[PDB]
Design a binder for this molecule. Structure first.
Ligand SMILES: Nc1nc2c(ncn2[C@@H]2O[C@H](COP(=O)(O)OP(=O)(O)OP(=O)(O)O)[C@@H](O)[C@H]2O)c(=O)[nH]1
Ligand SMILES: [Mg+2]
Lengths: 189, 120
């Protein structure tokens, strides 16, 4: 009612809401942790969700990581509300469930509660010998040919923390540039 | 002003009154007072915190409007909202900044953890 609308009207300008989703084991919680420089050597599969408030490039980023287990995916949309950017994390080594990765993503892109978020896809576990090439993950998931959202693919290793920044750095460029055109078209009308 | 810029400001008066009252502490105390149990002191949040959090918000604001008319009969929350929700950017005050504290989830989790800690 009131409080829900109030907050969405006087919402902070440089505060960004980031939702991290993707099949279990992918490495979502590994990314969050290995972003604040926390210890990855302790991560147990998440049954709930972690919120890691964190500043970067003038923004403060409220990042929600929700458990990716198959029996938890129904409750995923309790966190769709007010999402500024959607981080889809892929275990690029488990090619057997890549079929599944496509279905769950294509069902997210058409949610209308996420209709505005910018899509960042993390082709994680690139350090592994069995890891598929980003382009092979691109034709899989049918990443292109989606006229829904602005997107970018980023092959990364969450253990070494390689290519995690190039993705988040891009995400802001997109989100902020989307907010640029907000003010631009606002004041001129 | 002039004409029902009062109405609004006269409602603001209570968006201090009501929420600074020790009776607001009760309904909170009482609502929290039925899940001390189900609030673990870990950084990972339970999937069930969200449905409780939404019940919490729809109780705070459900109380706020049934209190605004215990003082201003002929008060319409839907009429108050709509107009307020734009045509008086006499919002922004150190007033609703208080009122959207309840939308902050981590501030809710922290104060909820303080309650289970207290009765243990
Ligand atoms: N080799 C390798 N392993 C990784 C990498 N990133 C994550 N892992 C491993 O993947 C496993 C799962 O990590 P999680 O962070 O729990 O993955 P998740 O997607 O959050 O799993 P859910 O909580 O079920 O959603 C862990 O054992 C990690 O060590 C990586 O970049 N390289
Ligand atoms: Mg996890």
């Amino acid at each position: 009612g009131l409080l829900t609308i109030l907050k969405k009207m006087k919402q902070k300008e440089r505060e960004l809401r980031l939702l991290m989703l993707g099949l279990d084991n992918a490495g979502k919680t590994t990314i969050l942790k290995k972003f604040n420089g926390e210890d990855i050597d302790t991560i147990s599969p998440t049954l709930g969700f972690n919120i890691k408030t964190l500043e970067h490039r003038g923004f403060k980023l409220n990042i929600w990581d929700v458990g990716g287990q198959k029996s938890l995916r129904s409750y995923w949309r309790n966190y769709f509300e007010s999402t500024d950017g959607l981080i889809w994390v892929v275990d690029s080594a488990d090619r057997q469930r890549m079929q599944d990765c496509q279905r769950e993503l294509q069902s997210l892109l058409v949610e209308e509660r996420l209709a505005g978020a910018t899509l960042l896809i993390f082709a994680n576990k690139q350090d592994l010998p069995g890891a598929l090439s980003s382009n092979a993950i691109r034709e899989v998931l049918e990443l292109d040919s989606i006229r829904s959202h602005h997107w970018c693919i980023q092959g990364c290793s969450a253990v070494t923390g390689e290519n995690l920044l190039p993705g988040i750095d891009w995400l802001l460029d997109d989100i902020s540039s989307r907010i640029f055109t907000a003010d631009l078209e606002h004041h001129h009308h | 002003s002039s004409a029902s810029d009062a109405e609004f400001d006269a409602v603001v008066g209570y968006l201090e009154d009501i929420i600074m009252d020790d009776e607001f502490q009760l309904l909170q105390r009482n609502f929290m007072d039925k899940y001390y149990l189900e609030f673990e002191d870990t950084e990972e949040n339970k999937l069930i915190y969200t449905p409780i959090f939404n019940e919490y918000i729809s109780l705070v604001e459900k109380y706020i409007e049934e209190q605004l008319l215990q003082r201003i009969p002929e008060f319409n929350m839907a009429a108050f909202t709509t107009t307020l929700q734009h045509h008086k950017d006499e919002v922004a005050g150190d007033i609703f900044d208080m009122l959207l504290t309840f939308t902050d989830f981590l501030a809710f989790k922290e104060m909820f953890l303080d309650y289970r800690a207290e009765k243990e």
